[PDB]
Design an enzyme around this catalytic site. Structure first.
Site, PDB file in Angstrom:
ATOM      1  N   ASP A  62       0.612  -1.011  -0.122  1.00 45.04           N
ATOM      2  CA  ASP A  62       0.021   0.054  -0.017  1.00 45.04           C
ATOM      3  C   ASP A  62       1.578   1.347   0.399  1.00 45.04           C
ATOM      4  O   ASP A  62       2.112   1.308   0.394  1.00 45.04           O
ATOM      5  CB  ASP A  62      -1.404   0.055   1.340  1.00 45.04           C
ATOM      6  CG  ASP A  62      -1.516  -0.952   1.468  1.00 45.04           C
ATOM      7  OD1 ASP A  62      -0.916  -2.832   1.505  1.00 45.04           O
ATOM      8  OD2 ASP A  62      -2.586  -1.358   1.746  1.00 45.04           O
TER       9      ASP A  62
HETATM   10  C1  LIG Z   1       0.233   4.197  20.579  1.00 44.73           C
HETATM   11  C2  LIG Z   1      -0.613   4.937  20.088  1.00 44.73           C
HETATM   12  C3  LIG Z   1      -0.975   6.293  19.477  1.00 44.73           C
HETATM   13  C4  LIG Z   1      -2.008   6.438  18.092  1.00 44.73           C
HETATM   14  C5  LIG Z   1      -2.364   7.605  18.041  1.00 44.73           C
HETATM   15  C6  LIG Z   1      -3.042   8.216  17.064  1.00 44.73           C
HETATM   16  C7  LIG Z   1      -2.943   9.154  16.100  1.00 44.73           C
HETATM   17  C8  LIG Z   1      -3.710   9.840  14.822  1.00 44.73           C
HETATM   18  C9  LIG Z   1      -3.952  10.505  13.547  1.00 44.73           C
HETATM   19  C10 LIG Z   1      -5.220  10.507  12.996  1.00 44.73           C
HETATM   20  C11 LIG Z   1      -4.634  10.798  11.679  1.00 44.73           C
HETATM   21  C12 LIG Z   1      -5.621  10.974  10.651  1.00 44.73           C
HETATM   22  O1  LIG Z   1      -6.807  10.555  10.554  1.00 44.73           O
HETATM   23  S1  LIG Z   1      -5.144  11.499   8.980  1.00 44.73           S
HETATM   24  C13 LIG Z   1      -6.759  10.937   7.789  1.00 44.73           C
HETATM   25  C14 LIG Z   1      -6.050  10.106   6.633  1.00 44.73           C
HETATM   26  N1  LIG Z   1      -6.157  10.444   5.187  1.00 44.73           N
HETATM   27  C15 LIG Z   1      -7.262   9.913   4.202  1.00 44.73           C
HETATM   28  O2  LIG Z   1      -8.127   9.770   5.113  1.00 44.73           O
HETATM   29  C16 LIG Z   1      -7.331  10.174   3.531  1.00 44.73           C
HETATM   30  C17 LIG Z   1      -7.888   9.451   1.766  1.00 44.73           C
HETATM   31  N2  LIG Z   1      -7.207   7.846   2.668  1.00 44.73           N
HETATM   32  C18 LIG Z   1      -5.741   7.485   2.194  1.00 44.73           C
HETATM   33  O3  LIG Z   1      -5.105   8.323   1.585  1.00 44.73           O
HETATM   34  C19 LIG Z   1      -5.445   5.820   2.087  1.00 44.73           C
HETATM   35  O4  LIG Z   1      -6.589   5.611   2.393  1.00 44.73           O
HETATM   36  C20 LIG Z   1      -4.250   6.635   2.937  1.00 44.73           C
HETATM   37  C21 LIG Z   1      -4.249   5.015   4.220  1.00 44.73           C
HETATM   38  C22 LIG Z   1      -4.171   7.806   3.417  1.00 44.73           C
HETATM   39  C23 LIG Z   1      -2.775   5.900   2.057  1.00 44.73           C
HETATM   40  O5  LIG Z   1      -3.016   6.442   1.054  1.00 44.73           O
HETATM   41  P1  LIG Z   1      -1.810   5.856  -0.226  1.00 44.73           P
HETATM   42  O6  LIG Z   1      -2.324   4.732  -0.408  1.00 44.73           O
HETATM   43  O7  LIG Z   1      -2.564   6.857  -1.005  1.00 44.73           O
HETATM   44  O8  LIG Z   1      -0.746   6.153  -0.168  1.00 44.73           O
END
Ligand SMILES: CCCCCCCCCCCC(=O)SCCNC(=O)CCNC(=O)[C@H](O)C(C)(C)COP(=O)(O)O
Ligand code: SF4
Ligand code: SF4
Lengths: 208, 176, 88, 386, 112, 115
Positions: free
Chosen positions: C43
């Site tokens: 991925d």
């Molecule tokens: C020890 C415990 C610590 C816990 C820490 C928790 C921190 C939480 C932080 C949350 C950050 C967010 O939500 S950030 C928001 C998340 N990003 C998106 O939703 C954009 C659309 N989705 C995508 O791009 C793909 O599903 C993706 C998987 C991203 C990869 O993509 P690629 O394949 O094209 O690289």
């Protein structure tokens, strides 16, 4: 209308109306509305883009000199397309007066931070971001101020429940404080208090 | 109209300067503070000999809650639920039904004393002087559960404290 | 003296060693020309982890805009060789 | 690399709930980062589920050192929204008990500040006066601090017979206790070394940082809401406004002591000018009828029932109402949607802005200086966190 | 001549008349670049000209302070500096222009 | 047109780049968090959890929502790095004291009324 009724002040009402007209004339680009309440309080409703130019004016103009930012808070009105009302309360010591500046935003639209106008705004904006989820652009250090570390949600929103979603207790198996979904031995008892008869005819709305 | 608190000037004559030097070298104001503490040492202390002596309280003092009776022994409470409605902490839980003789009486009257803020709004709201805040304040417990009062507990409190409660009400009711 | 004059073969071998330690890549069906997404099924997040491991191995940072283009071990080898000024 | 330290919450000078993350170089304070919310109880959301009367006791618990002043601020906001007027005797009682409350607060502030600095004895001398003042509270309301005495429309009950004489007896002696405190602190060279030129703030910075009260007047700003924007009967009492010159801890302490003396002056005037009459507004749709009327007349019973179940409706509108509380400007932004429960209630506490200014005020100082500056800001976290 | 303004951080200004003349002249110069029909320009020019004439008409500092209604001529100088900075910012912002957008239909309707 | 004001990113590509920056920062930080907080989990467990949290929001297609999610993730990382969080806050991500809630229809039917 004697002892029981609060007295009126026409002089202050007229002065505030004149100053509101003054402000609206000077800044037509941003001022959408001006109001004077019957207890002599002046409100200026502006477009969001004018948060910085208006406040700066009200701080720096020789005839305004609103040097003190008393308070900065938000109000949540879920029925509006722009959910959040942003309220600035300003005090001028030179003219012994107060003014209120109002603007609006939704969940996804940033509001310009006013720390360059009033430093006092810093924590206030943090609190708004903490309690309502309104993001302030170019804030020097924007983060939660009132809620617990890692807390999810914005409690002061109308759709956030009063008791929240999680509660805390000490667990001995893991030897630490843990968070678990909230369960109440007694549920908060919702009361329906509104009388079905209209109280104030002066505020009746058109029946659509 | 205002005054300045720290806008005075010292006189530069040799007398005042020498007095300042003597204060600097011989520590006169420190001796003044020592004299003040020594004076307090010989004053009579303000400590009362608790629990043999108690602090003064008013007839209006808000203490542990109680449920009252009419002089015939009938309960004053008629389950109107105004105290439950007004309670700012939602500490009161009331259930009612017609009694065997048809009277309007409660089957449940609970006060959570760990929710209660002891504001006295319940006794202001009560139309028949049924629920009161009594004068007792020494009712600490060893468990949380003992502070969840049911109707029997509150009726026992009323029966136990009515002699004092009635006198306090007689003292205060002309102000209410 | 300092580090020996690292070459393209050493770069390729160390890149392969770093990649074969990744738990989501089949150790024996990985080649110098394999594509992370098409063949290995990795991925986008997996690719970021792979570049971070490469940064750890070779001791210099790789920015996001450069790291996005690196989609096969050969691109990583060519990027490292170009940055380290190595022609053999 | 600076050393990072947790100053509080479990610290003697941290006031129980304040966690201050301090970056230090030796004992020099490189940075102050106050972390608050350890006493955030969600008061503003809880009020949205209460009637206005039900919401009143929440204000006792904001600045728990100045209860009746918070009650007065909230009552003034609600009375402005209701377009009603409290009766004159209620206003005089309000001003009298507000000045008693200012005495209580300034005693607490000055003596706890001295205790942080290291002078422990004046706390004990002055807390007996606080105890006597507590009795005045309990005699008027039945509670020592959380009185809930001041309500929209006036006060809950009239003064018991004999209260004015006892207040006069206390007031004719409090000046000597002030004199003893000043004999212990004012001219002491250790106290001056601990307070002079510590936490100096300019007038312009104080205004821009949202400061109020003594935090302004210590820097020379001639401002007092009781003088400029009077409420109740404050425009009928004579007093002076103490003004500092250096903007440091010592001038602010001097200002607070002089404010105690002026409060004694105001209390004397209030005692001599108390008028007769009713103590809440004669409008049974707002203030409840007397208990004898409730048990005799049908309208009184109906209005008692409705005011204690539904509560009075407030006309729609929003007001920002502020008073000169003992800790500075205390304000309420109250939004009514027309029903019997407030739509929104934002509480403005002076300690919020004052503590936000702590990192600015601590620049170039040590640990003990920061302790002194915390004491000089007069912070209570019930109002800071709400 | 005056020992102190009484305000922490506000220094005593020697030659306040010349400083005020310079500041008001600079304000008028900046305002001259603002469109003639802009309300900010005409209002600020009116008040600035009033203050400048008042400054030129009274050589006594105490009487000038009494006339200006500005509270201690050093704060008058500070307010003039604030007005000059605001005038430059307003020239950049051009708020004399028509409203950028009308709010939604029921944006300000209260209650609900 | 839709006339919408951005937060940081104009389209999805810059939002994805910011997501990748935040993910790299968290991935680098995890071992330090394990060491400093004296956790009983492995570094692999923490990174797997980080991945899981990111994957929770994979369906989002609005660049403004993505920017706000990245802002919140940066806030959480700053809380973690400065040890403003305690061990309880870090461990709250793992739900170690909550009993496993059934998902199939029959077990939910047996246990109660909730759908
Ligand atoms: C020890 C415990 C610590 C816990 C820490 C928790 C921190 C939480 C932080 C949350 C950050 C967010 O939500 S950030 C928001 C998340 N990003 C998106 O939703 C954009 C659309 N989705 C995508 O791009 C793909 O599903 C993706 C998987 C991203 C990869 O993509 P690629 O394949 O094209 O690289
Ligand atoms: S004293 Fe107040 S909180 Fe306690 S039961 Fe009565 S109304 Fe409720
Ligand atoms: S105690 Fe009084 S107010 Fe409460 S239900 Fe009984 S009669 Fe009504």
């Amino acid at each position: 209308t004697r002892p029981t009724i609060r007295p009126r002040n026409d002089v202050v009402h007229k002065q505030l109306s004149a100053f509101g007209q003054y402000v609206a004339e000077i800044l037509p680009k941003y001022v959408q509305q001006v109001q004077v309440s019957c207890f002599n309080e002046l409100e200026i409703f502006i477009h969001p883009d004018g948060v910085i130019p208006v406040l700066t004016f009200l701080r720096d103009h020789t005839n305004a000199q609103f040097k003190s930012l008393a308070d900065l808070t938000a109000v949540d009105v879920p029925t509006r397309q722009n959910r959040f009302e942003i309220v600035y309360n300003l005090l001028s010591l030179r003219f012994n007066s107060r003014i209120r500046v109002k603007t609006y935003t939704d969940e996804l639209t940033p509001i310009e931070s006013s720390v360059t106008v009033y430093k006092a705004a810093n924590w206030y904006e943090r609190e708004i971001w903490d309690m309502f989820g309104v993001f302030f652009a170019n804030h020097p250090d924007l983060r939660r101020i009132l809620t617990d570390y890692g807390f999810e949600g914005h409690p002061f929103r109308k759709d956030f429940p009063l008791s929240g979603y999680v509660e805390l207790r000490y667990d001995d198996e893991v030897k630490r404080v843990v968070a678990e979904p909230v369960e109440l031995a007694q549920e908060f008892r919702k009361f329906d208090l509104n009388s079905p008869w209209e109280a104030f005819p002066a505020y009746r709305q058109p029946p659509e | 109209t205002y005054k300045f608190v720290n806008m005075r000037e010292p006189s530069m004559d040799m007398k005042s300067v020498t007095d300042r030097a003597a204060q600097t070298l011989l520590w006169t104001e420190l001796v003044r503070g020592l004299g003040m503490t020594l004076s307090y040492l010989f004053r009579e202390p303000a400590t009362i000999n608790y629990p043999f002596e108690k602090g003064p309280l008013s007839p209006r003092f808000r203490g542990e809650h109680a449920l009252r009776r009419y002089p015939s022994g009938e309960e004053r409470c008629i389950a109107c639920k105004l105290c439950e409605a007004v309670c700012p902490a939602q500490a009161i839980t009331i259930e009612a039904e017609p009694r065997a003789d048809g009277s309007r009486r409660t089957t449940r009257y609970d006060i959570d004393m760990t929710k209660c803020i002891y504001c006295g709004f319940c006794q202001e709201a009560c139309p028949v002087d049924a629920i009161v805040e009594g004068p007792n304040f020494e009712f600490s417990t060893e468990t949380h559960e003992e502070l969840l009062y049911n109707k029997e507990k509150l009726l026992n409190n009323g029966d136990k404290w009515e002699a004092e409660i009635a006198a306090n009400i007689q003292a205060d009711y002309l102000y209410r | 003296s300092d580090a020996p004059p690292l070459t393209l073969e050493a770069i390729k071998d160390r890149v392969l060693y770093v990649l074969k330690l990744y738990d989501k890549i089949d150790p024996e069906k990985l080649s110098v020309n394999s594509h992370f997404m098409k063949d290995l099924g990795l991925d986008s997040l997996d690719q970021v982890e792979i570049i971070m491991a490469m940064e750890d191995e070779f001791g210099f940072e790789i920015p996001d805009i450069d790291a996005e283009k690196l989609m096969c071990p050969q691109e990583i080898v060519d990027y490292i060789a170009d940055k380290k000024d190595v022609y053999e | 690399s600076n050393l990072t330290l947790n100053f509080g919450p479990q610290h003697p000078a941290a006031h129980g709930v304040l966690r201050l993350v301090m970056e230090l170089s030796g004992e020099m304070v490189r940075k102050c980062d106050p972390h608050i919310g350890l006493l955030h109880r969600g008061t503003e959301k809880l009020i949205e589920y209460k009637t206005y009367l039900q919401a009143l006791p929440y204000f006792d618990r904001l600045d728990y050192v100045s209860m009746m002043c918070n009650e007065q601020a909230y009552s003034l906001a609600v009375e402005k929204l209701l377009n009603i007027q409290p009766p004159p005797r209620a206003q005089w009682i309000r001003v009298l008990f507000g000045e008693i409350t200012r005495l209580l607060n300034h005693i607490m502030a000055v003596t706890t500040h001295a205790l942080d600095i290291g002078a422990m004895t004046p706390f004990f001398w002055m807390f007996e006066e606080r105890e006597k003042m507590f009795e005045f509270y309990e005699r008027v309301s039945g509670a020592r601090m959380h009185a809930a005495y001041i309500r929209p429309g006036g006060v809950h009950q009239d003064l018991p017979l004999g209260l004015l004489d006892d207040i006069y007896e206390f007031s004719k002696n409090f000046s000597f206790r002030i004199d003893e405190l000043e004999e212990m602190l004012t001219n002491n060279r250790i106290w001056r070394n601990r307070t002079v030129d510590i936490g100096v703030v300019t007038a312009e910075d104080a205004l821009n940082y949202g400061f109020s009260g003594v935090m302004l007047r210590g820097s020379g700003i001639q401002w007092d809401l009781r003088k400029t924007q009077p409420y109740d009967v404050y425009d009928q009492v004579e007093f002076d406004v103490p003004i500092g010159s250096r903007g440091d801890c010592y001038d602010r302490y001097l200002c607070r002591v002089e404010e105690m003396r002026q409060s004694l002056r105001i209390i004397s005037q209030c005692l001599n000018k108390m008028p007769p009459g009713e103590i809440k507004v004669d409008d049974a749709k707002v203030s409840p009828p007397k208990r004898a009327e409730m048990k005799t007349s049908m309208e009184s019973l109906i209005h008692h029932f409705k005011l204690y179940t539904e509560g009075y409706q407030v006309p729609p509108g929003a007001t920002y109402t502020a008073i000169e509380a003992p800790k500075g400007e205390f304000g309420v932004y109250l939004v009514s949607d027309g029903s019997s429960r407030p739509y929104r209630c934002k509480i403005k506490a002076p300690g919020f802005a004052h503590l936000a200014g702590l990192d600015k005020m601590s620049k170039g100082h040590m640990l003990a200086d920061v302790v002194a500056i915390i004491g000089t800001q007069d912070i209570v976290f019930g109002e800071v966190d709400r | 001549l005056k020992k102190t303004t009484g305000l922490v951080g506000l220094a005593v200004c020697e030659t306040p008349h010349e400083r005020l003349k310079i500041l008001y002249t600079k304000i008028l110069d900046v305002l001259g670049q603002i469109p003639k029909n802009a309300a900010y320009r005409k209002y600020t020019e009116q008040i600035t000209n009033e203050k400048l004439g008042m400054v030129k008409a009274e050589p006594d500092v105490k009487k000038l302070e009494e006339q200006l209604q500005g509270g201690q001529i050093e704060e008058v100088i500070l307010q003039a500096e604030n007005e000059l900075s605001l005038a430059r910012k307003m020239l950049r912002w051009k708020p004399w222009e028509p409203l950028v957008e009308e709010p939604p239909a029921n944006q300000w309707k209260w209650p609900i | 047109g839709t006339s919408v004001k951005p937060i940081f990113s104009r389209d999805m590509n810059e939002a994805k780049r910011r997501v990748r920056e935040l993910y790299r920062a968290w991935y680098r930080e995890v071992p330090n968090t394990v060491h400093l907080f004296q956790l009983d989990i492995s570094v692999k467990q923490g990174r797997d959890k980080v991945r899981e949290m990111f994957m929770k929001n994979a369906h989002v297609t609005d660049p403004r929502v993505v920017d706000l999610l990245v802002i919140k993730g940066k806030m959480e990382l700053e809380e973690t790095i400065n040890v403003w969080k305690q061990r309880t806050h870090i461990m709250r991500f793992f739900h170690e004291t909550e009993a496993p809630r059934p998902t199939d229809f029959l077990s939910k039917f047996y246990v109660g009324h909730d759908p």
